[PDB]
Amino acid sequence: SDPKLTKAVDSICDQFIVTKSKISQLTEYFIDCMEKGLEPCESDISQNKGLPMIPTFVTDKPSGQEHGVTMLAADLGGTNFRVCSVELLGNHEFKIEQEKSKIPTFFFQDDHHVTSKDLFQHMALITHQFLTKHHKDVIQDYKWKMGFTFSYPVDQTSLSSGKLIRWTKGFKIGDTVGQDVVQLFQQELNDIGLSNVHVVALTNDTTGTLLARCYASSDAARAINEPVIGCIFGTGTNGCYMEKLENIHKLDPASREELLSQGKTHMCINTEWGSFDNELNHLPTTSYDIKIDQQFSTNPGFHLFEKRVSGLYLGEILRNILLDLEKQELFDLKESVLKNNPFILTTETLSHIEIDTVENDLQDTRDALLKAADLETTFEERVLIQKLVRAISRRAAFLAAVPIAAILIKTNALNQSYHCQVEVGCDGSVVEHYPGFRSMMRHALALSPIGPEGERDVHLRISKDGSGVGAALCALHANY
Amino acid sequence: SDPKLTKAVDSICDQFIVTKSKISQLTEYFIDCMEKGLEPCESDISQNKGLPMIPTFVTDKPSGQEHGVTMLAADLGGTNFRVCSVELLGNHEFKIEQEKSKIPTFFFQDDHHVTSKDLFQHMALITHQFLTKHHKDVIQDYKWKMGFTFSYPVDQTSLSSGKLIRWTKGFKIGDTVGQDVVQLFQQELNDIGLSNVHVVALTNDTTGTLLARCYASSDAARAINEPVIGCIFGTGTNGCYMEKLENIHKLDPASREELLSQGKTHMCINTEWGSFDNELNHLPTTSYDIKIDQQFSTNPGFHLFEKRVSGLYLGEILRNILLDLEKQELFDLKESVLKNNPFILTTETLSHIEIDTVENDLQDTRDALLKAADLETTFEERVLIQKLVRAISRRAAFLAAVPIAAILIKTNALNQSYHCQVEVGCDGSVVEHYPGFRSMMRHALALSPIGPEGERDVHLRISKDGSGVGAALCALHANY
Numbered sequence A, B: 001s002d003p004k005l006t007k008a009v010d011s012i013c014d015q016f017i018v019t020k021s022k023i024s025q026l027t028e029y030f031i032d033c034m035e036k037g038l039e040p041c042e043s044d045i046s047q048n049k050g051l052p053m054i055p056t057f058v059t060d061k062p063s064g065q066e067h068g069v070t071m072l073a074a075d076l077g078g079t080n081f082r083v084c085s086v087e088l089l090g091n092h093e094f095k096i097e098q099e100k101s102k103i104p105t106f107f108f109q110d111d112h113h114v115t116s117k118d119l120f121q122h123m124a125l126i127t128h129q130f131l132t133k134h135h136k137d138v139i140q141d142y143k144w145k146m147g148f149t150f151s152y153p154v155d156q157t158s159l160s161s162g163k164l165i166r167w168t169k170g171f172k173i174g175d176t177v178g179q180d181v182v183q184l185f186q187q188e189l190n191d192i193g194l195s196n197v198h199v200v201a202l203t204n205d206t207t208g209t210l211l212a213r214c215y216a217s218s219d220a221a222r223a224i225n226e227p228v229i230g231c232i233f234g235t236g237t238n239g240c241y242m243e244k245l246e247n248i249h250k251l252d253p254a255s256r257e258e259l260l261s262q263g264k265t266h267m268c269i270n271t272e273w274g275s276f277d278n279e280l281n282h283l284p285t286t287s288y289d290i291k292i293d294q295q296f297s298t299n300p301g302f303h304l305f306e307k308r309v310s311g312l313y314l315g316e317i318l319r320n321i322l323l324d325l326e327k328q329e330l331f332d333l334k335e336s337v338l339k340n341n342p343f344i345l346t347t348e349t350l351s352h353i354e355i356d357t358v359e360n361d362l363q364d365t366r367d368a369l370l371k372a373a374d375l376e377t378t379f380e381e382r383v384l385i386q387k388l389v390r391a392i393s394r395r396a397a398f399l400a401a402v403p404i405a406a407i408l409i410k411t412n413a414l415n416q417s418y419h420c421q422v423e424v425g426c427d428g429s430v431v432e433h434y435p436g437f438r439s440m441m442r443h444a445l446a447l448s449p450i451g452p453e454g455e456r457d458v459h460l461r462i463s464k465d466g467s468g469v470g471a472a473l474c475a476l477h478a479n480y
């Protein structure tokens, strides 16, 4: 027991407190940023520091009765790449064949040069392998339609076109920025004899999450649970929603009028809320967050909301806290390997600490810290490390509720029919598996302007779109 | 169209309102009735008018790692009888084969005499039919153990013995009352060559629901979701919970000390909360409820809470309201068959009205009323019937939350570790399929003394396991 270490920890934990008044302020500011982000910016989209609010050119929420021939789907995340074939049977049913593979660490390192051709050649070959394994009998001329789920910010110009704005989540491929990722992918498919495979749709992982949940939600569930948000809380964080065409002022007025005359009323918006308040006008900030953004992040000055929320960064926050406590001569790092190893403490490490119990002398915390960075600890040190972890995760979960509450308020989403609630489709390892993260998001929602009664009308449902149904639904609509 | 009918309906709807203060009163009173009911009744158990609080002789919550050879299970409800075989694989997994069949209307007509042998012979033959279909090769050669789920109040004397206290729901076989239902069932199994099938456990459907959730709940979910209540909202309503052995004063002190010395701390209590406040000291009561209890129910003076909540009675409430409005010359029943047909309006009929919409001129309500009792309606009449239905169902759901809040408060269930929440295993057609019932129960929980913060820690989870797994777990434990 070191009373000076205990007070230092309690003081740092206080730096992560998010009050009811703060949530209200951030919710209000988020809506302002939404409206600003819906206006056209005559600057560079890569220079823009506001809330991107990217039109996805998706205008229809699936009913569940969509059906068609087998579609192809490719899904590039922050960790895995998947190729799938999806047969939409209507009636909320589908057949899926998929192959999942980790993204090689080769694409995340700077010691050797990585090019766009490396990435998209790798993706085209995986596609070729999938088609050889699961659809060998299909003619080599078959007119495959493919939907491409690309979980990165894209300057979407149509359903099938858009240029990469900037990488995130540790990806470092310099020459992809400013390039149309559908063309890059299509060219590599062409080069290996798969020119008959046409990438006809491009969706963000938020967009796919919303569409897939709209299609799969049964008639009974859909009756009293209306999916209004598809969002992600994993390596990164983001969410989408349906905005009135009239409010999407950055959209060409002729395109708006054309869509309106076709009977459309809304278009899905990829908010890219990981980049909420990149200027830090209001986001809770500690010295540890600044250090992560400026020194250890791949995109300094951008995606600052994500750096306080998503799983890529929560462990790194703890590392910088322990390093600061060592400089203060309060914590003995012993023979650990924390120093000079950014991101060696993972959110997976924290997940073993969050609900560890003192009845077992916090043995899971000890093992996790030894396994991660060879950090020996005493019981008393683990008690304080647990406090730090819980403050980090609570702030992350409280902030995670802000974009959702803001969207629900701006769109008046809680105004529905009798008994009908709003469903927020959630995917990602943090919201799904980090113990207590969902419970704290719900607490924060109850504290937000929607109040406890609004939170009861909100269903944070784990809804995974890892099978490519979201991309498949977009490809089904598009023309070959 | 008729302002006098509209004001009469609004006035009737106001009679079904349950206020926050009322919920608080009923929640407090329920706890008092729990403590009274845990004492010896000092009278006949069949004469007892208090909260039964029946000890089930189940003292251990499954861990999920139980495993063994295939067990048999039989489940007699108020509508169906099902036989199944359950293979417990450990690791929260199991294989189940089951056959469901309606209870013949022969057992529902008093026009001819029905005996216990009729019922249990029918059950034994269905069991034989199940074994012939799914286990033909070893029907007569296996020493089968069977768990018996009997969804009726039983004066349980051990895990495998208990006498029927009284029938509920649409059942009445006089010679079963006071008889050990395990012996009645076992005797009929013996008579058809199934003496090798041993009924070794007897559980209420509430008890089985809790056990099944304890076994099926994954390690991760179980870590932050402790199942504390198994409850039913179907034809009837009821729930069970784990009570400290020291508080079960009606239990023989020698048995309590024996169990305690064996390391046991709790026993599951079948509350039979359908019989909460049979004297109507506080329960909301209308003339329609009194008419149902005194004239149309099989058990007048008992199960009065159930008669305001469960699916057997909600439709019958609407029938008595429409009959009252006709006597007043305010509602035209036309050529309907409502009069002199108790229970012809079902909760299934009401489920089609609850979220029917005026955008479709309430056509589903029109069809449901014609199909149920040949009641033609105008749009205005359907609008008012919908108001009545919604007032009936809201009262049912608000009352349904009272026993749950009371149990959680009495047992200090919300006092747990960090992030740990309580799970309430729910089964039955009403909570599962009646639109909005679960949402209204959650509102009522937020209004109860546990408050909105308590409701967020409560998860009303629909039991996708059933009472067969619960009975199978008890059979696995018992000796052949």
Ligand SMILES: OC[C@H]1O[C@H](O)[C@@H](O)[C@@H](O)[C@@H]1O
Residues within 6 Å of the ligand: A078, A151, A152, A153, A168, A169, A204, A205, A206, A232, A235, A236, A237, A238, A239, A272, A274, A303, A306
């Ligand atoms: O994957 C979640 C989220 O992570 C980052 O914020 C970006 O790459 C987004 O495009 C993506 O939606």
Ligand SMILES: OC[C@H]1O[C@H](O)[C@@H](O)[C@@H](O)[C@@H]1O
Residues within 6 Å of the ligand: B151, B152, B153, B168, B204, B205, B206, B232, B234, B235, B236, B237, B238, B239, B272, B274, B306
């Ligand atoms: O089936 C739910 C419930 O219905 C009635 O209340 C009784 O028969 C109970 O024994 C039973 O648990």
